[PDB]
Amino acid sequence: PERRHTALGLGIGGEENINPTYHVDKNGKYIQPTTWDMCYPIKTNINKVL
Amino acid sequence: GSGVGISTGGWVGGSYFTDSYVITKNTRQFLVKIQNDHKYRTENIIPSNAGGKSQRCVSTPWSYFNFNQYSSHFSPQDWQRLTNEYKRFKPRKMHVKIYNLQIKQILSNGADTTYNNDLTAGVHIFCDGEHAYPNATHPWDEDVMPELPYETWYLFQYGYIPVIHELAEMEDANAVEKAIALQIPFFMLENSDHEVLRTGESTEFTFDFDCEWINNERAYIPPGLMFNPKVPTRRAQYIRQHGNTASSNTRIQPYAKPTSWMTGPGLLSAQRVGPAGSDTASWMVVVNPDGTAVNSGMAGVGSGFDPPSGSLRPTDLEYKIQWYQTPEGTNSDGNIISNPPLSMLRDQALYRGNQTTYNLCSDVWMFPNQIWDRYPITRENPIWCKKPRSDKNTIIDPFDGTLAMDHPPGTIFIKMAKIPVPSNNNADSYLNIYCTGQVSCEIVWEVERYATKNWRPERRHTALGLGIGGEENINPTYHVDKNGKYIQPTTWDMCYPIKTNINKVL
Amino acid sequence: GSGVGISTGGWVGGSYFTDSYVITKNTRQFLVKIQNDHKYRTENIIPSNAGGKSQRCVSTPWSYFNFNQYSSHFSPQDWQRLTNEYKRFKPRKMHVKIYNLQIKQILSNGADTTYNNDLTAGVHIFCDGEHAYPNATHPWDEDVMPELPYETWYLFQYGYIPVIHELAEMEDANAVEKAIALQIPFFMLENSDHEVLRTGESTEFTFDFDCEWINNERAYIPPGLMFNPKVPTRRAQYIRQHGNTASSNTRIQPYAKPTSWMTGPGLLSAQRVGPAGSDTASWMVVVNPDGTAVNSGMAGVGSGFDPPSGSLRPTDLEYKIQWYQTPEGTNSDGNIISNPPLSMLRDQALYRGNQTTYNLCSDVWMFPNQIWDRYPITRENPIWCKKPRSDKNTIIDPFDGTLAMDHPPGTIFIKMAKIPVPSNNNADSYLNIYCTGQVSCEIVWEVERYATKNWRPERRHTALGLGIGGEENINPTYHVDKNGKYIQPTTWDMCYPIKTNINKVL
Amino acid sequence: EFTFDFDCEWINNERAYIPPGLMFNPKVPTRRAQYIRQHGNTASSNTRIQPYAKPTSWMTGPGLLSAQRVGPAGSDTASWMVVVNPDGTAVNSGMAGVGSGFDPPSGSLRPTDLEYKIQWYQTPEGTNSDGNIISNPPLSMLRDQALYRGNQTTYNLCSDVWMFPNQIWDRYPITRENPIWCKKPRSDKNTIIDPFDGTLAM
Amino acid sequence: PYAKPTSWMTGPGLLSAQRVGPAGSDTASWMVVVNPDGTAVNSGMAGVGSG
8 A cells, every 4th residue: 555645644623623724613713734745735645655 | 370379377466546436456365175975965963062053054065255344355555545545435347257277186195295297187167146045255255366466365165055944953842843844944055057178268247336425425414503603593492391390481592593303223231141162243133033932042943133233332342343353353352343433423322301310221223314324334344245135125235335237246155076996895085186277257346436626625544543463563554573473453443443534415 | 450460569679870870779589477476575694604794685577678788789890890980979869678578377287387478468668767766787797688689588576675674684672773774765656657569669868968978099108208308397396315325406307307297096915804705895885873783794885996006007808808708608707808008097006105115006096187097998898887876976087987877867677567367265376478579779879080180000890800710710809619609808908998999188 | 718738748747766886786796806004003905895785876856055144034044155246335234135045955965954944824814933834754765865075084964066967856846835837037047957946947 | 015025047157267368378267178088298388278
């Protein structure tokens, strides 16, 4: 198997700290990714044979 | 052309993914050896500690191919790609070839043994497509095609259970025991017309599937939770008087809206029984018609039914499906225990209000307006099962996740042609031979891609969930160590189950 | 027709020269034996004196053909004629046949061993033309087709490096070490569709080259030296005041005309390090992303880069390419050390005026308006290399003289079909077999003849430059002695390099 | 309504599991020989290269690690400063006024510290190391790289890797938070175009 | 906002060296020589090089 981007790498934040990343809190504010991996970069998942 | 020095095929392998369908190609090297001294025997299997459980088997000369497993058809790469990219799949067409056969003679002098080929020797290949014979294969058995394409596949001897043994033991005098025994069927595979091959011949078999889809989508909420919490409801509820608290009639709360839907069935009441050597199951299905003396406990008469739980939450580890990842696995070492997929249709429970609290009711029988999911299946699950032919049946969803079929892929049986040798006094002396060859299995799988309106990312299967093991403990799962041994997944999530990644809107 | 007693081809050999193209035909006898016990293994290669350098390899059952070498395709006669008569050549088309295969069983009783053929046995042949697998071949390795057409070619086992070992050693607890390890790829060649052959079958493979020319012409003057020394120049120069010598502005001398062109790049600063058992290179290219502890020296993390010099004059013998002409060569015995071709583009230097003298600057990076020649290649050089697939790269001229290709000739892999034997207790007992056969390689080479307006004679490669060696020291180079041993060239000029004979006007 | 066509280079989502210098069969011996000059009491030696040590023909991508950022945050602060100051005009203040400044300088090389790493803020309200996302290694073997220089005793990291023949690298791994393209300035001459911010120059 | 960093770089050039020696000689800050091997160094690099 190869690496993939999973929602399980995402974090949880908000006012009540119950909402996950890329969701909205009770004030309408949109939870932003805290770390660089939560932004799902490329050149990670798919292997190549040089 | 064709001849001794010409190969009858070549190695096929790999997987070809399209949006409409997937094709898995697999080739193995197999070994056929003489089984059971070229003779049919009927023996009693009677272990000492089984607590009265005993069976009689009919052992044959024949061996058979078993393709029923996911790990055999899909690689961990192919499986990951399937469960990540597709919400549905079912097997469609299956094509099997047997070719490049080599029959050799075993000359055993002593500690040394030599091997010489014999070009005139032959091998019997019978495929049963009408299921006129007892089914050779049963789910979860260890006889399936190997997972690693370079591993050799050793056939397993064919045999079947002709009668429940305790019924026909016919101890002393019993009229019905005598009658059941006289009716015991006996099946020889030689009554069929089959094919004999020499080293230059090959064979092919096609199979079509009439199947139900395997569904890879996940439910994020229970079916009873689908409502707008804001909108009020018209419905009223009545609470009978209990204690000093008087009765009341009142409108149902907008967040409390009652469901019209129900928990899937399952049986949690029973517990397993007795020594491990015995057949141990919480629920035991017996056939004991009349007449025949009770004799020992019901373990001998019965089969036993697990997993009993179905869709309900297993209370303990007795109710959970667990297996061993290798044949060397023993005693809670190398065993994989099923876990909840975290699908809301998959795990369920019923509680019964006593007017004070709620109490779990253990036996949930089948009831109108029930919804559930089939068991989430990994690579380590069998694909299909044989659906027994009968007048009446209820809804068919084997709790092991398999697809029940009226006509599964027909079993291919194979046997070494008996070569007799002369004898001065009359005995059975066969010539000692074996055949190795190449078998290719090509299954065409019908698939469907998902499209979602969900904004957020979804769960996927990642190699980052895998573990690391080996002799030096440096190699990851699904890799080989320095001894050639293949690292097996330690946990149920490393097996990449379905009904996890892809969300659905109920 | 075809059969056991019919040959599937014949011996091809020789070379056919025309003005437009050259065709080299070569046939060899090869031997395939069972490798690695028919199993994939992943082992740690950890020598004691390497100074922290350790690698893990994935060893396979497979073996492969390696055609990358000039000595294998061209005879010393053919090579001489090529480098004398043609100013350009490149490989165009390559056709490979494998035929006349013989699989035999090895019966080892004891000190004696016997060999019996088995006509039903087979051999796997896989050619990877899409490069879906780790490349089998690397320049300068000893595995190439033999130079003498009557010598037997022994396959070498295929294997690849799956991960940098020191990164994935995952000592104690590290998060990134764990992640790199879980991503280690694993390649089996059985996932591919390939061909199985018996003794009467044969196979063929074609390959096309997309290449750049190899240029055999020589430069008699540097590019900065091309001017008419008589004609005066308009250009003026300014010399800043230094000592008691006052400043001056003056016209440049007609013989001193300044060049608009520049020295090719190369790195002379570094020196090799440490014990010979270690990887020893002046320049070390490492990948150490983050996280993982430094642990030992950079030798374990890095690869190392030589020859560093490129077009610049090697200061010492550390910077010069040198190899051994035979596998028995050790310790400065039988080693050939590259020398200057005496081409003016090939050797170069930069000096930096300090106002008093000039000082050699060691690191010449890549800079506009640079000209140089590729390394002059002999028969003992490899022909091509694999160009790694990547987003971005600079100008591609491997300093070993090879032609980098996006898609080199696909590696042909070959393996003995595993023949299992029965066993009472379950073990892997294969039947012990090997295959010998004939492989022919036909390359079509595109060439171009030179025409010159030079009056004088030009240098050529002569047998008079060759040496004399042997047991009796009476035989010349490229001949055989009384023991059958083939006399190897002692010096780099006896190998007939290019970029020597044929002049060009820049 | 408006239409636009792109003339572009691909964005490549594939990963490299080993460095380009690590591709060889470790078992097969090599013909190549190496020479170790005499150093200390240890005498010189000429010997065959080990099969596991095979030397690469390929090179580290370029990048500049030497410089450090300068001065107060209000100023333009960059390790490397590209200025245009033709002639004439008085020097006046520091080069900060004349110059633009160039980051990320590192390119494909491993950032030594957080000065060399790309980082941004995910919201306009982000301030002072709160809500900032700092780029990390993708764990691709083409993406992070280094050069070391043997002094005959140990290896020492050389900070400035200029562009050199036979170099391989990967473009910066891009997230959703990256810009897609950039404007390629119109000029006579230029080198290979790979903006270190991962954008597609057009 | 006024300090935005550039993705673009200064063109190449070599400013380190200085010219050398008498005007009659070939005088250049940078000297490109071809001196393959063998031949004695003899005089300064001015004779071997172009500049």
